[PDB]
Amino acid sequence: GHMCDAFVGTWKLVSSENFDDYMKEVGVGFATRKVAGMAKPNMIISVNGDVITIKSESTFKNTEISFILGQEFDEVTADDRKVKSTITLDGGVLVHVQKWDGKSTTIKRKREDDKLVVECVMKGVTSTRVYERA
Ligand SMILES: O=C(O)C(F)(F)C(F)(F)C(F)(F)C(F)(F)C(F)(F)C(F)(F)C(F)(F)C(F)(F)C(F)(F)F
């Protein structure tokens, strides 16, 4: 249960690039996009045996996903998509693919320097969000 040791802890947002464009490509509505952009999320990543939990906390929406690496699971995203999600550990990076409605998006959670970087890709649009330890 050590696969994820470099990710565990609490994290807070430093910077965001192209996040609104990413949500646009995903199909998120205007009001939800504006709420999401205003959020200052606190992210908690924790491990309990084989089960990893990623929690995002913000004033107006929390999400929590718990999963086993490599095991597909049902996720209801913050924008209310019902997706089939699989997260694997590849080259020290958590690679999260969401599949729904004939579409897919990939969320990579990686370490760079002392930061946790979240890279989200939808049809060639990439958002990069940088977190520092809380
Ligand atoms: O900052 C992070 O923790 C993050 F980068 F990991 C993340 F949270 F942004 C994400 F990757 F999970 C995400 F982009 F997919 C997302 F969950 F936010 C979303 F953009 F897909 C979303 F649309 F669901 C929304 F922004 F939360 C919504 F618009 F619904 F509020």
XYZ file of N, CA and C and ligand atoms in Angstrom:
433
model
N 0.801 -1.209 0.000
C 0.000 0.000 0.000
C 0.838 1.265 0.000
N 2.031 1.181 -0.589
C 2.956 2.308 -0.637
C 2.997 2.996 -1.997
N 2.274 2.463 -2.990
C 2.294 2.985 -4.356
C 2.073 4.493 -4.407
N 1.272 5.027 -3.492
C 0.763 6.386 -3.619
C 1.387 7.323 -2.586
N 2.482 6.906 -1.934
C 3.026 7.657 -0.802
C 3.388 9.103 -1.148
N 3.811 9.383 -2.380
C 4.180 10.753 -2.729
C 2.976 11.668 -2.922
N 1.759 11.126 -2.939
C 0.562 11.927 -3.155
C -0.209 12.198 -1.875
N -0.017 11.383 -0.835
C -0.850 11.477 0.359
C -0.587 12.785 1.097
N -1.657 13.373 1.615
C -1.603 14.596 2.384
C -2.716 15.530 1.959
N -2.601 16.785 2.378
C -3.552 17.811 1.988
C -2.841 18.866 1.150
N -3.588 19.438 0.204
C -3.051 20.287 -0.849
C -4.023 21.433 -1.102
N -3.482 22.584 -1.513
C -4.288 23.766 -1.810
C -3.845 24.366 -3.140
N -4.790 24.985 -3.845
C -4.548 25.411 -5.222
C -3.634 26.635 -5.279
N -2.624 26.578 -6.142
C -1.752 27.720 -6.425
C -2.172 28.446 -7.695
N -2.356 27.704 -8.788
C -2.585 28.323 -10.082
C -3.411 27.388 -10.952
N -4.090 27.984 -11.931
C -4.910 27.248 -12.883
C -4.734 27.859 -14.266
N -4.548 27.006 -15.263
C -4.411 27.423 -16.652
C -5.392 26.630 -17.506
N -6.189 27.336 -18.310
C -7.113 26.738 -19.287
C -8.216 25.872 -18.669
N -8.493 26.017 -17.374
C -9.493 25.166 -16.740
C -10.868 25.419 -17.328
N -11.193 26.682 -17.592
C -12.504 26.956 -18.154
C -12.628 26.377 -19.560
N -11.570 26.487 -20.369
C -11.589 25.888 -21.703
C -11.780 24.381 -21.622
N -11.092 23.727 -20.678
C -11.277 22.298 -20.476
C -12.733 21.974 -20.151
N -13.328 22.660 -19.158
C -14.741 22.409 -18.886
C -15.647 22.704 -20.059
N -15.318 23.705 -20.873
C -16.114 23.955 -22.068
C -16.118 22.740 -22.988
N -14.939 22.159 -23.240
C -14.867 20.989 -24.119
C -15.617 19.800 -23.538
N -15.599 19.656 -22.216
C -16.330 18.580 -21.564
C -17.833 18.794 -21.696
N -18.276 20.048 -21.760
C -19.683 20.375 -21.888
C -20.324 20.996 -20.664
N -19.524 21.441 -19.692
C -20.051 22.021 -18.466
C -20.752 23.339 -18.775
N -21.919 23.539 -18.163
C -22.667 24.761 -18.375
C -22.000 25.977 -17.759
N -22.463 27.154 -18.198
C -21.822 28.415 -17.825
C -21.787 28.611 -16.311
N -22.939 28.478 -15.646
C -22.999 28.748 -14.209
C -22.096 27.801 -13.421
N -22.121 26.509 -13.756
C -21.239 25.561 -13.084
C -19.773 25.893 -13.328
N -19.421 26.257 -14.566
C -18.055 26.693 -14.862
C -17.647 27.878 -13.995
N -18.556 28.842 -13.807
C -18.202 30.036 -13.047
C -18.011 29.711 -11.565
N -18.879 28.858 -11.000
C -18.684 28.367 -9.631
C -17.347 27.654 -9.502
N -17.078 26.725 -10.421
C -15.839 25.958 -10.365
C -14.621 26.869 -10.400
N -14.657 27.906 -11.242
C -13.523 28.807 -11.353
C -13.291 29.638 -10.110
N -14.361 29.962 -9.382
C -14.244 30.735 -8.151
C -13.710 29.911 -6.990
N -13.754 28.586 -7.093
C -13.432 27.733 -5.961
C -11.940 27.757 -5.649
N -11.623 27.683 -4.357
C -10.262 27.537 -3.857
C -10.185 26.169 -3.194
N -10.035 25.094 -3.960
C -10.221 23.755 -3.386
C -9.070 23.304 -2.503
N -9.431 22.570 -1.452
C -8.499 21.860 -0.581
C -8.653 20.392 -0.946
N -7.557 19.749 -1.337
C -7.575 18.365 -1.787
C -6.903 17.478 -0.746
N -7.564 16.384 -0.388
C -7.051 15.412 0.574
C -6.904 14.087 -0.142
N -5.700 13.529 -0.119
C -5.442 12.222 -0.712
C -4.968 11.299 0.397
N -5.582 10.120 0.482
C -5.308 9.213 1.587
C -5.399 7.782 1.081
N -4.758 6.876 1.812
C -4.701 5.465 1.443
C -5.150 4.639 2.645
N -6.038 3.677 2.402
C -6.466 2.733 3.426
C -6.372 1.346 2.800
N -5.271 0.650 3.076
C -5.010 -0.618 2.410
C -4.919 -0.429 0.906
N -5.785 -1.135 0.175
C -5.824 -1.045 -1.281
C -6.674 0.102 -1.790
N -7.389 0.788 -0.910
C -8.379 1.784 -1.315
C -7.791 3.181 -1.156
N -7.664 3.900 -2.275
C -7.197 5.285 -2.304
C -8.401 6.208 -2.371
N -8.350 7.310 -1.627
C -9.409 8.307 -1.644
C -8.829 9.654 -2.055
N -9.475 10.295 -3.024
C -9.177 11.673 -3.393
C -10.418 12.497 -3.090
N -10.285 13.446 -2.170
C -11.384 14.313 -1.780
C -11.038 15.737 -2.177
N -11.996 16.428 -2.781
C -11.868 17.839 -3.127
C -12.900 18.599 -2.313
N -12.463 19.581 -1.538
C -13.360 20.342 -0.683
C -13.353 21.789 -1.136
N -14.542 22.350 -1.349
C -14.650 23.774 -1.615
C -15.965 24.253 -1.032
N -16.097 25.574 -0.946
C -17.245 26.151 -0.263
C -18.552 25.618 -0.829
N -18.652 25.495 -2.149
C -19.932 25.140 -2.734
C -20.022 23.729 -3.299
N -18.913 23.012 -3.448
C -19.039 21.604 -3.797
C -17.855 20.799 -3.291
N -18.161 19.653 -2.685
C -17.185 18.631 -2.354
C -17.384 17.445 -3.286
N -16.287 16.786 -3.639
C -16.343 15.475 -4.266
C -15.428 14.536 -3.501
N -15.738 13.253 -3.595
C -14.930 12.230 -2.950
C -15.018 10.992 -3.816
N -13.874 10.509 -4.278
C -13.800 9.248 -5.000
C -12.883 8.308 -4.228
N -13.305 7.065 -4.088
C -12.489 6.028 -3.478
C -12.387 4.884 -4.472
N -11.181 4.348 -4.640
C -10.948 3.418 -5.736
C -9.757 2.529 -5.418
N -9.690 1.417 -6.139
C -8.534 0.529 -6.152
C -7.852 0.717 -7.502
N -6.532 0.848 -7.499
C -5.827 1.085 -8.755
C -6.114 -0.048 -9.732
N -6.516 0.319 -10.946
C -6.786 -0.650 -11.996
C -8.203 -1.176 -12.040
N -9.042 -0.820 -11.074
C -10.391 -1.353 -10.970
C -11.383 -0.270 -11.363
N -12.152 -0.516 -12.420
C -13.090 0.497 -12.880
C -14.175 0.702 -11.834
N -14.637 1.944 -11.710
C -15.678 2.277 -10.745
C -16.581 3.366 -11.310
N -17.751 3.516 -10.691
C -18.697 4.550 -11.089
C -18.395 5.843 -10.354
N -18.325 6.938 -11.107
C -18.063 8.265 -10.566
C -19.143 9.201 -11.080
N -19.715 9.993 -10.182
C -20.594 11.090 -10.564
C -19.779 12.363 -10.388
N -19.414 12.993 -11.502
C -18.501 14.126 -11.439
C -19.204 15.357 -10.863
N -18.402 16.391 -10.587
C -18.937 17.612 -9.995
C -19.937 18.291 -10.923
N -19.810 18.079 -12.230
C -20.755 18.598 -13.207
C -21.857 17.597 -13.550
N -21.985 16.520 -12.769
C -23.115 15.588 -12.838
C -23.070 14.671 -14.059
N -21.878 14.356 -14.547
C -21.733 13.291 -15.528
C -21.626 11.974 -14.781
N -22.308 10.955 -15.290
C -22.145 9.591 -14.791
C -21.108 8.885 -15.656
N -19.916 8.671 -15.100
C -18.789 8.180 -15.880
C -18.282 6.868 -15.297
N -17.629 6.088 -16.159
C -16.878 4.906 -15.751
C -15.409 5.315 -15.648
N -14.847 5.188 -14.450
C -13.511 5.686 -14.159
C -12.544 4.551 -13.845
N -11.320 4.654 -14.371
C -10.237 3.761 -13.973
C -8.996 4.599 -13.725
N -8.339 4.362 -12.590
C -7.118 5.070 -12.210
C -6.014 4.045 -12.024
N -4.899 4.258 -12.712
C -3.748 3.373 -12.643
C -2.521 4.184 -12.251
N -1.494 3.489 -11.772
C -0.219 4.121 -11.432
C 0.760 3.751 -12.539
N 1.200 4.760 -13.293
C 2.046 4.583 -14.464
C 3.185 5.584 -14.367
N 4.404 5.079 -14.209
C 5.568 5.942 -14.129
C 5.464 6.971 -13.027
N 4.982 6.568 -11.855
C 4.875 7.491 -10.744
C 3.755 8.504 -10.852
N 2.862 8.360 -11.835
C 1.758 9.284 -12.086
C 0.441 8.533 -11.922
N -0.535 9.170 -11.278
C -1.887 8.618 -11.235
C -2.615 9.023 -12.512
N -2.960 8.038 -13.346
C -3.615 8.287 -14.628
C -5.074 7.867 -14.505
N -5.977 8.839 -14.616
C -7.411 8.660 -14.392
C -8.119 8.899 -15.722
N -8.782 7.871 -16.247
C -9.590 7.986 -17.460
C -11.062 7.885 -17.086
N -11.869 8.825 -17.588
C -13.314 8.808 -17.422
C -13.928 8.558 -18.789
N -14.824 7.572 -18.870
C -15.490 7.198 -20.113
C -16.999 7.325 -19.935
N -17.646 8.039 -20.853
C -19.095 8.198 -20.799
C -19.603 8.669 -22.159
N -20.780 8.172 -22.557
C -21.500 8.725 -23.708
C -20.636 8.739 -24.970
N -19.806 7.710 -25.143
C -18.942 7.642 -26.306
C -17.777 8.603 -26.286
N -17.448 9.149 -25.116
C -16.429 10.172 -24.958
C -15.455 9.723 -23.884
N -14.309 10.396 -23.832
C -13.360 10.129 -22.766
C -12.601 11.402 -22.435
N -12.123 11.473 -21.201
C -11.233 12.538 -20.760
C -10.219 11.908 -19.816
N -9.000 12.445 -19.801
C -7.942 11.913 -18.952
C -7.488 12.984 -17.969
N -7.369 12.606 -16.703
C -6.890 13.476 -15.630
C -5.626 12.829 -15.093
N -4.489 13.499 -15.248
C -3.230 12.999 -14.710
C -2.868 13.799 -13.469
N -2.616 13.101 -12.373
C -2.181 13.712 -11.127
C -0.730 13.300 -10.916
N 0.168 14.274 -10.937
C 1.594 14.003 -10.934
C 2.295 14.883 -9.911
N 3.517 14.493 -9.583
C 4.376 15.311 -8.744
C 5.374 16.048 -9.627
N 5.548 17.339 -9.358
C 6.603 18.138 -9.966
C 7.150 19.025 -8.865
N 8.473 19.036 -8.687
C 9.094 19.818 -7.605
C 8.429 19.413 -6.291
N 7.967 20.368 -5.486
C 7.231 20.111 -4.261
C 5.720 20.169 -4.474
N 5.270 20.209 -5.730
C 3.876 20.443 -6.078
C 3.170 19.154 -6.483
N 1.845 19.197 -6.402
C 0.985 18.217 -7.049
C 0.317 18.943 -8.206
N 0.506 18.420 -9.417
C 0.003 19.024 -10.645
C -1.098 18.138 -11.211
N -2.230 18.748 -11.540
C -3.361 18.046 -12.133
C -3.500 18.528 -13.568
N -3.309 17.620 -14.519
C -3.413 17.895 -15.948
C -4.656 17.197 -16.485
N -5.590 17.970 -17.035
C -6.853 17.446 -17.546
C -6.890 17.688 -19.042
N -7.239 16.660 -19.815
C -7.228 16.747 -21.273
C -8.578 16.292 -21.816
N -9.167 17.094 -22.704
C -10.411 16.736 -23.386
C -10.248 17.226 -24.816
N -10.297 16.305 -25.779
C -10.196 16.615 -27.213
C -9.134 17.672 -27.522
N -7.919 17.436 -27.035
C -6.802 18.313 -27.350
C -6.710 19.612 -26.566
N -7.663 19.919 -25.686
C -7.541 21.065 -24.784
C -7.007 20.571 -23.446
N -5.956 21.219 -22.945
C -5.291 20.781 -21.723
C -5.376 21.870 -20.662
N -5.824 21.495 -19.472
C -5.801 22.371 -18.310
C -4.728 21.886 -17.345
N -3.998 22.827 -16.741
C -2.955 22.504 -15.775
C -3.235 23.252 -14.482
N -3.387 22.514 -13.382
C -3.662 23.108 -12.080
C -2.578 22.674 -11.106
N -1.959 23.644 -10.439
C -0.822 23.401 -9.559
C -1.284 23.558 -8.119
N -0.961 22.562 -7.285
C -1.277 22.574 -5.864
C 0.020 22.531 -5.061
N 0.040 23.252 -3.939
C 1.104 23.170 -2.947
C 0.553 22.498 -1.697
N 1.448 21.996 -0.857
C 0.991 21.360 0.368
C 0.271 22.373 1.258
N -0.863 21.952 1.821
C -1.616 22.806 2.740
C -0.936 22.889 4.107
O -8.447 20.695 -9.238
C -8.628 19.450 -9.214
O -8.601 18.824 -8.121
C -8.879 18.699 -10.516
F -8.097 19.252 -11.489
F -8.583 17.376 -10.343
C -10.340 18.865 -10.925
F -11.125 18.891 -9.806
F -10.446 20.059 -11.580
C -10.803 17.719 -11.837
F -9.713 17.231 -12.501
F -11.338 16.711 -11.084
C -11.833 18.181 -12.884
F -11.268 19.158 -13.654
F -12.133 17.121 -13.695
C -13.156 18.691 -12.284
F -13.694 17.713 -11.496
F -12.943 19.811 -11.528
C -14.108 19.015 -13.449
F -13.579 20.029 -14.195
F -14.185 17.908 -14.245
C -15.546 19.397 -13.053
F -16.194 19.790 -14.189
F -16.177 18.293 -12.551
C -15.664 20.568 -12.070
F -14.774 21.545 -12.415
F -15.400 20.154 -10.795
C -17.079 21.151 -12.141
F -17.174 21.999 -13.208
F -17.991 20.147 -12.296
F -17.354 21.835 -10.991
